[PDB]
Amino acid sequence: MATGIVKWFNDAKGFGFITPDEGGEDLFAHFSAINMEGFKTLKEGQRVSFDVTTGPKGKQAANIQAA
Amino acid sequence: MATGIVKWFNDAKGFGFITPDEGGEDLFAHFSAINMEGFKTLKEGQRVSFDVTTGPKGKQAANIQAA
């Protein structure tokens, strides 16, 4: 499965462009193209925003979102 | 509240640690802490994996997931 970095994205009409990693031309990416199963976990390197809260494991990230 | 980068995560037991951006101690991040509303859009700089497919806008990213 191919990979790449999101180059830019406007929330108004809900799409952006992805630069593919292994070379090639930029891809159009509509928000509706997001597979929600693809984001049920967190990934190494992934930038995220969150609330900070004290839980059982101590200081923890709540309400995690993409940043 | 705050932002940060996911430093390390383990898909088996479903938890990892986030290093906060604006200084501080690393935070425990369980996958159930993920707010799905937080990922319905794509973010600038976000690393993603995808199918490639020809749609109306031309070459497009399909089935987009976090990478």
* For chain B, domain boundaries: 2-67
Beta bridge partner(s), residue A33: none
- Classify A57 as helix, strand or coil: coil
The highest-level CATH class for domain A2-67 is mainly beta
Experimental determination approach used: X-ray
**How far is the CA of B15 from the CAs of B9, B29, B33, in angstroms?**
6, 6, 9
CB–CB of A67/B54 below 8 Å?
Answer: no
Alpha carbon of B35: minimum distance to chain A alpha carbons (Å): 5
**Which is it for the CA torsion A42, B5, B29, B34, positive or negative?**
negative
Rounded to whole angstroms, the Cα distance separating B61 from A5 reads 11
CB atoms within 10 A of CB A62: 17
Given an 8 Å threshold on Cβ–Cβ distance, is A49 in contact with B9? Answer: no
Question: Cβ of B53 under 8 Å from any chain A Cβ?
Answer: no
CA atoms within 13 A on the CB side of A66: 24
This structure's resolution (angstroms)? Answer: 2.6
Rounded to whole angstroms, the Cα distance separating B60 from A67 reads 22
**How far is the CA of A6 from the CAs of A33, B16, B35, B43, in angstroms?**
13, 23, 20, 7
Alpha-carbon A28 to chain mean position: 16
